[PDB]
């Protein structure tokens, strides 16, 4: 069985999932005759003076400036002085195929068992950001990529570069409940013919006014319970979510501020931890002399922090993916500079329709148990919390080709 | 589809007990009856938009 | 799953007297029963030929040099503890392979297995493997009683 | 100014580490650098000090498949810290090291 | 009266006897009656990504 | 417990106490130790971690 390209057995993405959705990789953009670089250079090879006679050194490979290797641990927020230090890392060249894409979901298939990705040779790409014009600050072993972007679809895009990704809609494709539709029941053009031999008459006379499928469903809810998942007859009930079809808006449980902190915990709020030296002191006269063998990392003021407001951010994720994502088409828009397939009812259209913001937020019908007036015409079983369809799709596999 | 098979299950009754049970079910008054559990006639009627 | 047609029938006939009339979810299941504990499952894995070099098996043999690049720049190096701080720069990912979507890899092989918990298997010493009695029919047979055998 | 985290990923990332990746066998673990362990493999200080390998269980491992780990089949699932009974049988006596029962 | 045999397991006989009489969902702390179980999503687990 | 639940700025590249250092990339003279600036190239680099 082939499931086709519309299958996606999970939510979100599976490539660079911790990245922010607007984040670009270290790459080389081209607009006009100009070409642009954006880069993050973790390592150092310090190489003071002019930075040329060591950029010629430290030869590179497909895996040697490793993107996982960075600064050494416990360097803190070290200010890399561009004079007397230099950067190291990887970029990707231009003149490569595909479409430029952010970090969130960027895939690039490997070539060898060492983990390299480059389909051609590797080259160094030197960039200075000083006021000296005779210094090389980074080396940036460049790369050429075929640029696949699975499981993400450009939530926004402005013409080359400043695009934001978003993972595709989860789409479970499996067989039906109880294998409905596998077998021609009540199809008078082509029926079944159980009989004795010398087939003068069969005993299956099936009419179009009968439904043998729904007759089996109401019988099955009479003999047994319907909660249990029986994998032989593919007996998994189609259910919705009780808190999604009827959203019970109760606000959120507020508490203490959910602060976040820098891990090197001591710092000035807009400066690194200032170095210093201890002081021995004289008493009976006010004279403080510098002590002998001491260096001191001193942070002043209070610890800098940011505030989250976590249950509001936790609820709005629930309301967006479960309620605001499953709208009718009249409350959705298409993003700018992207193009959809011409028909409706396909995967590339419904993937690229994104909802209007103010129709569902954490304030709508506040305090009231009330299903939305526009969601009564929407089928509540075409939803990714349908535990039966999640059970029927994962029972076959997770890829596109299944030997059922 | 690449291949397909029907499976059945023959109950291993004794051939003396089966032969007494076969002759009772060949009889006309011991006629097997079944009924559809839904018991309904499906009819669909069109509604225009609006 | 992997469980055979011979041996799923004997487990449902011993525990729930099914077989010869179609299998359904039984009425009263116990804590150490078969059908509430049997949980089948399936996954799919790519072929891993010469085109696809199996970066995970190269990682288990030598984790000191990483072949595997996923969400770098947002976590620690994958040769030290994952509890540590972010290390690298953002960059594309090369692993795992996309098994679904428009860039889905062909030549996929399926794998099936099952897990059973809290369940001794059972093969009843009966003629049709049902439960027609506690003192079963072959247990009071004149062949197996009134004689002495030695099984292997 | 603001910072941004992928919040529903981090709730899922700490679930996979603390349950599946924490209870790996002895093959898929390693001691960290410059720290000592007891000699026997059955004491508490040896199980405590060993931290698992980074990315054999992650947020991507076998996406979209109801599938237990191939090495966690023969690992006893009842030696978990989420069994509601053994948790209840230990809260029932108390929280201290020394207790009268 | 008591004649214990090594071929017998009386602490497993009481486990199967109790699961036939009552339900093993209830916690009856008098006999320290509480099952050993596992989380249904740690053993066989569903990697559905994240909403 | 688990791994650290870090939060990052929405632009990923940064100098930790400054904006990203803007400048121009260029080539070298290939066994003459001189790097002359080339045209139609601008860049911006964080030089540290995130």
DSSP state letters, chain D = ---B--HHHHHHHHHHIIIIITT--GGGEEPPTT----SSTTSHHHHHH-EE-TTSSSSSTTTT-B---SSSSSS-TTSSTT-HHHHHHHHTT-SSSS---
Q: Where are the alpha helices (DSSP H) in A294-395?
A: 310-319, 347-351, 387-394
C48 touching chain A per CB within 8 A = no
Bridge partner residues of A36 (DSSP): A29, F42
* Binding partners of B (≥3 Cβ pairs within 8 A): A, C
Q: Are D62 and A314 inside 8 Å of each other by CB?
A: no
Query: Which residue in D has a C-alpha nearest to residue A173's C-alpha?
Result: D64
In angstroms, rounded to a whole number, what is the distance separating the alpha carbons of residues F8 and F16?
11
B4 touching chain A per CB within 8 A = no
Chains B and D make contact, 3+ CB pairs within 8 Å: no
Q: Count other C-beta atoms under 10 Å from residue C71's C-beta.
A: 27
User: Of C34, C43, C118, which to mutate for an interface test with E (greatest number of E Cβ within 10 Å)?
Assistant: C118
What the block records as the tokens of A31 is 């607009």
* Binding partners of E (≥3 Cβ pairs within 8 A): A, C, D
In angstroms, rounded to a whole number, what is the distance separating the alpha carbons of residues A132 and A284?
53
Chains F and D make contact, 3+ CB pairs within 8 Å: yes
- Nearest CA distance, A173 vs chain C (angstrom): 11
Query: Which residue in A has a C-alpha nearest to residue D62's C-alpha?
Result: A398
What the block records as the tokens of A302 is 């209070």
In D, which residues are within 8 Å of E43 by CB distance? 68, 72, 77
Enter the resolution in angstroms: 3.4
Characterise A240 by phi-psi region: left (phi > 0), alpha (psi -120 to 50), beta (else). beta
CA A141 to chain centre: 27
Cα-Cα-Cα-Cα dihedral of A211, A180, C18, C8, to 10°?
Answer: 170
In C, which residues are within 8 Å of A18 by CB distance? 71, 74-75
A238-247: b (≥16 Cβ within 10 Å) or e: ebbeeebbeb
Query: With contact defined as beta carbons under 8 Å apart, do A174 and A147 qualify?
Result: no
Q: Is the dihedral of CA F32, F37, F43, F49 positive or negative?
A: positive
Strand, helix or coil at B5?
A: coil
Query: With contact defined as beta carbons under 8 Å apart, do C34 and C112 qualify?
Result: no
Q: Chain C to chain E, count of Cβ pairs less than 8 Å apart?
A: 14
In angstroms, rounded to a whole number, what is the distance separating the alpha carbons of residues A68 and A24?
16
CA A19 to chain centre: 8
User: Of C43, C56, C77, which to mutate for an interface test with D (greatest number of D Cβ within 10 Å)?
Assistant: C43
What the block records as the tokens of F10 is 């929405």
In A, which residues are within 8 Å of D65 by CB distance? 9, 394, 397-398
What the block records as the tokens of F19 is 């904006």
Bridge partner residues of A7 (DSSP): none
Bridge partner residues of A281 (DSSP): A288
Query: With contact defined as beta carbons under 8 Å apart, do A17 and A152 qualify?
Result: no
Maximum C-alpha span of chain C: 81
Nearest to A52 by CA among F43, F36, F34, F41: F34
């Amino acid at each position: 069985l082939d499931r086709g390209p519309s299958f996606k057995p999970y939510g979100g993405t599976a490539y660079n999932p911790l990245a922010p959705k607007s984040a670009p990789i270290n790459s080389a953009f081209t607009v006009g005759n100009d070409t642009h670089f954006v880069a993050q250079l973790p390592q150092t090879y310090a190489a003071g003076g002019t930075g040329v006679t060591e950029a010629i050194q430290q030869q590179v490979s497909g895996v040697d400036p490793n993107p996982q290797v960075g600064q050494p641990n416990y360097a803190g927020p070290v200010v890399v002085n561009t004079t007397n230090n230099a950067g190291l890392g990887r970029i990707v060249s231009a003149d490569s195929e595909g479409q430029q894409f952010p970090c969130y979901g960027a895939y690039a298939p490997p070539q060898s068992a060492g983990g390299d990705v480059s389909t051609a040779a590797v080259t160094k790409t030197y960039i200075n950001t000083t006021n000296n014009n005779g210094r090389v600050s980074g080396t940036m072993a460049t790369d050429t990529i075929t640029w696949e972007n699975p499981d993400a679809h450009f939530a926004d895009f402005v013409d080359d570069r400043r695009a934001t990704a978003a993972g595709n809609r989860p789409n479970y494709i499996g067989f039906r409940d109880n294998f409905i539709g596998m077998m021609y029941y009540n199809s008078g053009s082509n029926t079944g013919s159980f009989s004795s031999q010398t087939q003068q008459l069969n005993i299956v006379l099936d009419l179009n006014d009968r439904n043998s499928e729904l007759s089996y469903q109401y019988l099955l809810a009479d003999l047994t319970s319907r909660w249990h998942y029986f994998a032989l007859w593919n007996q998994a009930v189609d259910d919705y979510d009780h808190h999604v079809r009827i959203l019970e808006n109760d606000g959120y449980e507020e508490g203490p501020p959910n602060l976040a902190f820098p891990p090197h915990v001591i710092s000035n709020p807009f400066a690194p931890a200032a170095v210093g030296t201890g002081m021995t002191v004289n008493e009976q006269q006010q004279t403080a002399a510098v002590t002998a063998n001491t260096v001191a990392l001193i942070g002043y003021g209070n610890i800098p922090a940011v505030e989250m407001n976590l249950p509001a951010n936790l609820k709005r994720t629930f309301l967006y993916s479960n309620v605001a994502m499953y709208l009718p088409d009249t409350y959705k828009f298409t993003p700018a500079n992207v193009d959809l397939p011409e028909n409706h009812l396909s995967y590339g259209y419904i993937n690229g329709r994104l909802p209007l913001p103010n129709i569902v937020d954490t304030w709508t019908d506040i305090g009231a148990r009330w299903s939305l007036d526009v969601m009564d015409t929407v089928n509540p079983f075409n939803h990714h919390r349908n535990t039966g369809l999640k059970y029927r799709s994962q029972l076959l596999g997770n890829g596109r080709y299944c030997d059922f | 589809y690449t291949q397909i098979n029907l499976y059945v299950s023959f109950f291993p009754m004794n051939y003396d007990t089966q032969s007494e049970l076969e002759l009772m079910l060949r009889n006309a008054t011991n006629d097997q009856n079944f009924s559809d559990y839904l018991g309904a006639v499906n009819n669909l009627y069109q509604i225009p938009a609006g | 799953s992997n469980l055979t047609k011979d041996f799923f029938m004997v487990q449902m006939a011993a525990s729930y007297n099914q077989g010869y009339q179609g299998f359904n979810w039984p009425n009263c299941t116990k804590h150490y029963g078969f059908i509430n504990n049997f949980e089948p499952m399936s996954r799919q894995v790519p072929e891993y030929g010469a085109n696809y070099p199996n970066l995970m098996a190269a990682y288990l043999a030598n984790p000191q040099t990483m072949p595997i690049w996923n969400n770098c720049g947002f976590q620690q190096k994958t040769a030290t503890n994952v509890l540590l701080e972010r290390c690298g720069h953002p960059y594309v990912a090369n692993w795992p392979y996309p098994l679904s979507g428009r860039n889905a890899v062909p030549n996929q092989v399926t794998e099936r297995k099952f897990l059973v918990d809290r369940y001794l298997w059972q093969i009843p010493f009966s003629s049709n493997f049902l439960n027609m009695g506690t003192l079963t029919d072959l247990g009071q047979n004149v062949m197996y009683a009134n004689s002495s055998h030695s099984l292997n």
